[PDB]
Amino acid sequence: GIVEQCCTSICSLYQLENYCN
Amino acid sequence: GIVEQCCTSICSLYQLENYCN
Amino acid sequence: GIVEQCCTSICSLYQLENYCN
Amino acid sequence: FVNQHLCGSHLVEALYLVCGERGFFYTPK
Amino acid sequence: FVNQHLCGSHLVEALYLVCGERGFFYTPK
Amino acid sequence: FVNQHLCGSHLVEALYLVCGERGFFYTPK
Ligand SMILES: *C(=O)CC[C@H](NC(=O)CCCCCCCCCCCCCCC(=O)O)C(=O)O
Ligand SMILES: *C(=O)CC[C@H](NC(=O)CCCCCCCCCCCCCCC(=O)O)C(=O)O
Ligand SMILES: *C(=O)CC[C@H](NC(=O)CCCCCCCCCCCCCCC(=O)O)C(=O)O
Ligand SMILES: [Cl-]
Ligand SMILES: [Zn+2]
């Protein structure tokens, strides 16, 4: 999930985009 | 206080409401 | 820098003002 | 130790929402 | 452990910006 | 280590307020 991926290391804008609709 | 209660564990909306006027 | 100064201890408004233009 | 300072920022935003037209008190002990 | 809770607050703000008119899903596993 | 990243988010908000019409520079060393 997004919290595991992105609160344990910094997520780029590209990686955050995996969670868009 | 609110910082002791709510920064050491997550406060629900119900628990936060104790700090309303 | 600002991150070293102000994320390892709380920066007052006076100390933050060193980073204004 | 800016963790409490930053937590507090989020607490005030949450109390604004929770408390509504009642408003709130923010008093760091 | 409010660290995840506060991180999540920032994640949703970032996804709002990233995703735009697509919008997003926020599902804490 | 997203702690610095999230701290930085709050720093920029604080500098916006502090600096006013002067504006500011944000340069993570
Ligand atoms: C619970 O915490 C998760 C347990 C377990 N682990 C996972 O990591 C979740 C894996 C499924 C989520 C979708 C994965 C997307 C495709 C992964 C390929 C890697 C390429 C891109 C890397 C990235 O994600 O940025 C689980 O089974 O859920
Ligand atoms: C300094 O850090 C505080 C020291 C000490 N401890 C306290 O916990 C404060 C107690 C007084 C605050 C008002 C308490 C409200 C009623 C408590 C009953 C528990 C039921 C609800 C639980 C909850 O608060 O969510 C002190 O003396 O101040
Ligand atoms: C890398 O992390 C920095 C390494 C090293 N250390 C520094 O501390 C940076 C020093 C130069 C920045 C300008 C300093 C301004 C004047 C300092 C005088 C102290 C009075 C006010 C105290 C305050 O800053 O609040 C480096 O060489 O960069
Ligand atoms: Cl934070
Ligand atoms: Zn934060």
From Swiss-Prot, chains A, B, C:
Disulfide bonds join C6-C11. This is Insulin A chain. It comes from Homo sapiens (Human). The gene is INS. The chain holds residues 90 to 110 of 110 of the full protein.
Curated annotation (Swiss-Prot), chains D, E, F:
Coiled coil: none annotated. It comes from the Eukaryota. Changing F24S: In HPRI; Los-Angeles. This is Insulin B chain. It comes from Homo sapiens. The chain holds residues 25 to 53 of 110 of the full protein.
